[PDB]
Design an enzyme around this catalytic site. Sequence first.
Site, PDB file in Angstrom:
ATOM      1  N   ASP A   1       0.696  -1.576  -0.412  1.00 26.49           N
ATOM      2  CA  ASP A   1       0.387  -0.023  -0.170  1.00 26.49           C
ATOM      3  C   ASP A   1       0.682   0.842   0.184  1.00 26.49           C
ATOM      4  O   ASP A   1       2.064   1.347  -0.854  1.00 26.49           O
ATOM      5  CB  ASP A   1      -1.205  -0.363   1.493  1.00 26.49           C
TER       6      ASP A   1
ATOM      7  N   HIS B   1      -3.877   5.930   3.150  1.00 23.48           N
ATOM      8  CA  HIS B   1      -4.485   4.658   2.740  1.00 23.48           C
ATOM      9  C   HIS B   1      -4.724   3.052   3.060  1.00 23.48           C
ATOM     10  O   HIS B   1      -4.823   2.315   4.034  1.00 23.48           O
ATOM     11  CB  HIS B   1      -4.752   4.610   1.687  1.00 23.48           C
TER      12      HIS B   1
ATOM     13  N   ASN C   1     -13.064   0.205  -7.502  1.00 29.92           N
ATOM     14  CA  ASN C   1     -13.822   1.136  -6.966  1.00 29.92           C
ATOM     15  C   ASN C   1     -15.182   1.904  -7.742  1.00 29.92           C
ATOM     16  O   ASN C   1     -15.976   2.535  -7.585  1.00 29.92           O
ATOM     17  CB  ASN C   1     -13.586   2.096  -6.401  1.00 29.92           C
TER      18      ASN C   1
ATOM     19  N   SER D   1     -11.517  -1.047  -0.584  1.00 29.28           N
ATOM     20  CA  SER D   1     -10.048  -1.151   0.004  1.00 29.28           C
ATOM     21  C   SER D   1      -9.993  -1.416   1.604  1.00 29.28           C
ATOM     22  O   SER D   1      -9.127  -1.935   2.185  1.00 29.28           O
ATOM     23  CB  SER D   1      -9.263   0.183  -0.005  1.00 29.28           C
TER      24      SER D   1
END
Length: 269
Positions: free
Chosen positions: A32, A62, A153, A215
């Site tokens: 990430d 994130h 997404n 996520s």
Amino acid sequence: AQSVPWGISRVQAPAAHNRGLTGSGVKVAVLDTGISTHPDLNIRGGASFVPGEPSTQDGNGHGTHVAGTIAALNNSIGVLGVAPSAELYAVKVLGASGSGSVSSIAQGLEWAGNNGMHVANLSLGSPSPSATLEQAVNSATSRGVLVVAASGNSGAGSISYPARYANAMAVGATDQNNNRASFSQYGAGLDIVAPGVNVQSTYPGSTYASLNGTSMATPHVAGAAALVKQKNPSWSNVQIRNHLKNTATSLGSTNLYGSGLVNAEAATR
Ligand SMILES: [Ca+2]
Ligand code: NA
């Protein structure tokens, strides 16, 4: 006081914790934007493949949020991960902007398989395929890692890569009612779903924040995998993956939901 986010309750993680299963001794790589040090996290190590940015810490947030869904510490503050004793590794493959390259992601997957990771969480993806990415997912899998990845997404009815590759476990997102979140990509290749709406977790600056995304679903299943590994330390990546699917709560419509909603209680009996 510690708060248990609604998704951690919905996947029944505390039932696992009450059996002594918390992910202790299980190595989970978070590929990430990094993982910030935070009072409610323990980062054991990691690596970075993002040129020019710091090798530790998370200039986006994130990766820190994702990390906390897996493994926020069980204590008197913050939140509570699915696997609060998991050994977290910060594998920085996305920069502070939140994007990366096929190169860096592949380099992270190589690192994970070479460093004995049991689980690699990839809360990232794109709609389009890459042979380099494919080969990297296969590599981590060959070296024994369970690759868990977000469906994406866009909300559309094909899933993103690397999730779409057979050797990655693809995770979509449900809302608070267990219905598909509007942004949750679905279609052929989806394995499972998990909570991904209004998910509160750790954030840089010693704070907490809620996020929507596939996520945020992904790390619920990465943590569940750690629970199952602790209970069954000789099991392969594939055995864990299959058990998680087999013990999920069916939601019907597998095109939308895969095998259903991850169930940490059922997975750790
Ligand atoms: Ca906590
Ligand atoms: Na897949």
